[PDB]
From Swiss-Prot, chains A, B:
Species the sequence originates in: Megathura crenulata (Giant keyhole limpet)
Similarity section: Belongs to the tyrosinase family. Hemocyanin subfamily.
Portion of the full-length sequence here: 1265 to 1472 of 3414
Residues noted as binding Cu cation 8 in the record, renumbered to the chain: H176, H180, H207
Name this protein carries in UniProt: Hemocyanin 1
Subcellular location: Secreted, Extracellular space
Known function: Hemocyanins are copper-containing oxygen carriers occurring freely dissolved in the hemolymph of many mollusks and arthropods.
Assembly: Homo-didecamer, with two decamers assembled face-to-face at their open ends. This didecamer form a stable 25 nM cylinder wall.
Processing after translation: Probably N-glycosylated. The didecamer is almost evenly tagged by a total of 120 sugar trees.
């Protein structure tokens, strides 16, 4: 089905990104962080709960629902579009979690980006973000740096096996959560939390 | 010569430190950072130049002089004493650079310390410090994470060979500088700089 392939933008694995590609990304995200969209965009996922603008709030993301992949799919494009506005040359990269990784990706990991072209020292926007409403810094605590296994693959693979979409989604969603808990770990403000997770930039890569 | 061994405090390799020992250290440093001593103590090494309180300033540390090991030796105890005031149970640990290290020490490396006993999320004071006078954050850029070699050993070993103290010092000082450049790298505010280096907490461990 032709519908899956895109003409316009390409999303590549994070490792694949060239220095130039990454450089656009570093900048775009930093600018997005500066711009209004980044904080507000984060809100969509969870806190602050936007779903009911007025009245009791609820987290917006559909989870535990078959709608779930669609929602997140839309979410990623939202950020992607923001990045493009930012001037990102390429689509949000995806961190292939299934593939066993010797180490965490350099792009996310780097605390600071030298960006030699313009002498400047700045934190890597990819590395983290802050949570404006709840004044804090997002944190990550991979308890298990250990992940090197078929386990991700088995879970995903099993999901792949199902013909039924709904059967597929339930399995698919579960594997999806593994990255969140694994990266976030204990940290209250992290990937591990429903509300907080949107803040971390890894979120975008993982969802991609 | 009995003069070398101490009765009172013990300095151990960083790896050796027990979780309890490290915990005291994490706290003590954090408190020292909070206290007045930490920033001021840093000043002794370099900027701001304290040597001439009034008049043209010069960096205080003796370098390129035979006095050099003595000066730094005094410097470490100064911080150590501060730590004890802080309530540190043990002396400043030493990061045996000569030994080839698979990875950088966990104590220094950790960005944040969970410190489960008291639920709190804080940066690791060991990880870094800020430079108050020149508003900035210290940075580290090990260009070469590569260091796994006899090279450190050869240099130090050669130094060991000399009977003459002065002959010894020149060789000794040079090997000493390797850690500074290697950790600091390109970063303007880092171990690599004479003025800035004091700020990084690694400085203490290395000098130890
Ligand atoms: O699910 Cu809402 O975050 Cu991956
Ligand atoms: O020398 Cu003054 O710093 Cu190691």
């Amino acid at each position: 089905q032709a519908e899956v392939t895109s003409a316009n933008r390409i999303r590549k694995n994070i490792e694949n990104l060239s220095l130039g590609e990454l450089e656009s990304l570093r900048a775009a995200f930093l600018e997005i962080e500066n711009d209004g969209t980044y904080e507000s965009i984060a809100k969509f996922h969870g806190s602050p709960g936007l779903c009911q603008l007025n009245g009791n709030p609820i987290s917006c993301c559909v989870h535990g629902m078959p709608t779930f992949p669609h929602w997140h799919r839309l979410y990623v494009v939202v950020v992607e579009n923001a990045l493009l506005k930012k001037g990102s040359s390429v689509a949000v990269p995806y961190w292939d979690w299934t593939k066993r990784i010797e180490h965490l990706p350099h792009l996310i990991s780097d605390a600071t980006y030298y960006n030699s072209r313009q002498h400047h020292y700045e934190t890597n926007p990819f590395h983290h973000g802050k949570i404006t409403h709840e004044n804090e810094i997002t944190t990550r605590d991979p308890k298990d740096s250990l992940f090197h296994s078929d386990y991700f693959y088995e879970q995903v693979l099993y999901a792949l096996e199902q013909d039924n979409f709904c059967d597929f989604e339930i399995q698919l969603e579960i594997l999806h959560n593994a990255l969140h808990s694994l990266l976030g770990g204990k940290g209250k403000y992290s990937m591990s939390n429903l509300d907080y997770a949107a803040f971390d930039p890894v979120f975008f890569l993982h969802h991609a």
